[PDB]
Design a protein around this ligand. Structure first.
Ligand SMILES: NC(=O)c1ccc[n+]([C@@H]2O[C@H](COP(=O)([O-])OP(=O)(O)OC[C@H]3O[C@@H](n4cnc5c(N)ncnc54)[C@H](OP(=O)(O)O)[C@@H]3O)[C@@H](O)[C@H]2O)c1
Ligand SMILES: NC(=O)c1ccc[n+]([C@@H]2O[C@H](COP(=O)([O-])OP(=O)(O)OC[C@H]3O[C@@H](n4cnc5c(N)ncnc54)[C@H](OP(=O)(O)O)[C@@H]3O)[C@@H](O)[C@H]2O)c1
Ligand SMILES: [Ca+2]
Ligand SMILES: [Ca+2]
Ligand SMILES: [Ca+2]
Ligand SMILES: [Ca+2]
Ligand SMILES: [Ca+2]
Lengths: 258, 262
């Protein structure tokens, strides 16, 4: 099973998914948990079927199923967010994506962020590189924080620290889907993106993008992230990583509550 | 020699289209400078787009005057027959940092009454236009009044850096979620399309909002000052563009507790 052969299958499934999604939206149903739609659930279930059929040994860690059965020592693992940006899907029908990442004996090998509304497939392949619709991505120019746009959820952080980030950055922007805000960092459009409480599926693809494009991707302590577990995280241009972490840890830390 | 709105519209949409053929080169040789201070930018792209539009007017509409960001506008008065307001690049910060999420804004006023408006999202090749008597369109798909959105059900957009944190927080608590594209024209079009409930800019110039007046009229949006008053298109004013169903609630929040400033 070469990486290229697997990649062929995935890109092909993603392409057929264009033909399914307009119908799911047509008949869009929404519900609460404490949002999720038929689109989230169906995309996920079809991917499960795809695996059953092409890669029966492979396991799936995904948002809309239980993941109690997933362990540290698993050979072939897919982590999926079937729709990242559900709020955007529901309210805007735009600015949402599918996230897929393949880990072989725990090492990231393939990653996908499919911006379906703009028909832009970001992909990362170990040994080949990272690509947007087959235009090859390269390491972005250095961005010092003062010269860069940052993205984060300001509703979930201490107001002192939110203000410090505003003062230290060039501007603030928010797409509102972790995958897409993270790709803005990979493309050099944003300096950094922060999500203070992500699940494994919110960040799964980003590990390989960060490695191949020389981005820093760490916890808000600067540590490695366990892809099997969440952690408060940042994906950042290498030139503004330290400054952002310094700000987040200043003033008794970034958490809104102690 | 007297032209219909449709004939003017043909000329403008056509000039916008040929502008696609100029811009990739301006971006290739992009240079940037400051104007007022470190966060107040302008590029060859802003200036060139503007100047070519000035030439376009000279040559097709020689009576018509231009109010635009990158020129002095001291000579523009309240009783001007044919006026264009232009923002040659709205979203300069996005142009520079992202090469995405910026637009061109054009609006034609005849004896002070809006007749034609344009928001050209050039990176996505989406031409929003509004024509009195015909309606509003995105690439010639016709736009219609959006469904009612109460604030609690709606995404809002505003610059959180320019308001006090207390009022920012109140807006976050009262809305469904918060998003920011970062170009007035595009954030406003999200309101017109029903994607956002409201967009706020607390200190816009005439070119930041010029096209939005006609869009708001034809699509039944509320577009007012943060006091709920009519805006003078010739001058700024702190402003909101909003779905009709969340307008009052947003203004109430902005004005509460001694206000949104600071
Ligand atoms: N810590 C953060 O930076 C953050 C960011 C967003 C949301 N949230 C929380 O989620 C709830 C609704 O979200 P919102 O409108 O603020 O964001 P949202 O716009 O609904 O979601 C934005 C991004 O955050 C992800 N997300 C959803 N719930 C999350 C959570 N509890 N923690 C971290 N990421 C999450 C989303 O993934 P899906 O689209 O796959 O849901 C999406 O990628 C709120 O209670 C909020 O506190 C936290
Ligand atoms: N690190 C910092 O200290 C920092 C960072 C960001 C902002 N700020 C402060 O916040 C202000 C705005 O900067 P920004 O980068 O957030 O704006 P921005 O993202 O560059 O602009 C967003 C939208 O507002 C328009 N705009 C630009 N300047 C404006 C102004 N002074 N008032 C109202 N609308 C304006 C833009 O139009 P055009 O692109 O067409 O002009 C665009 O439509 C500045 O006065 C600055 O002092 C400070
Ligand atoms: Ca999801
Ligand atoms: Ca997610
Ligand atoms: Ca400007
Ligand atoms: Ca401008
Ligand atoms: Ca502007």
């Amino acid at each position: 099973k070469t990486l290229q052969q697997i990649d062929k299958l995935i890109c092909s499934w993603l392409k057929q998914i264009d033909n399914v999604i307009p119908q799911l939206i047509m008949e869009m149903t929404t519900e609460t948990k404490r949002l999720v739609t038929n689109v989230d659930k169906q995309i996920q279930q079809q991917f499960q079927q795809f695996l059953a059929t092409y890669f029966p040994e492979h396991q799936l860690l995904a948002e809309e199923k239980s993941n109690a059965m997933i362990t540290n020592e698993i050979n072939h693992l897919w982590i999926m967010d079937p729709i990242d940006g559900t709020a955007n899907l529901v309210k805007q029908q735009e600015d949402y994506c599918i996230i897929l990442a393949y880990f072989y004996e725990g090492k990231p090998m393939l990653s996908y962020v499919y911006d379906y509304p703009h028909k832009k497939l970001y992909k990362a392949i170990r040994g080949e590189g990272a690509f947007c619709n087959g235009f090859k991505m390269e390491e972005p120019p250095s961005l010092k924080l003062e010269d860069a746009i940052i993205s984060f959820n300001a509703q979930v952080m201490n107001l002192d620290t939110v203000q410090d980030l505003f003062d230290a950055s060039f501007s603030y922007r928010l797409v509102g889907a972790c995958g897409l805000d993270s790709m803005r960092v990979a493309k050099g459009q944003f300096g950094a993106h922060i999500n203070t409480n992500p699940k494994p599926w919110d960040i799964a693809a980003q590990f390989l993008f960060a490695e191949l494009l020389n981005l820093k991707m760490t916890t808000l302590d600067g540590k490695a992230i366990d892809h099997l577990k969440g952690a408060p995280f940042i994906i950042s241009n290498k030139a503004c990583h330290e400054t952002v972490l310094k700000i987040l840890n200043a003033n008794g830390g970034y958490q809104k509550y102690r």
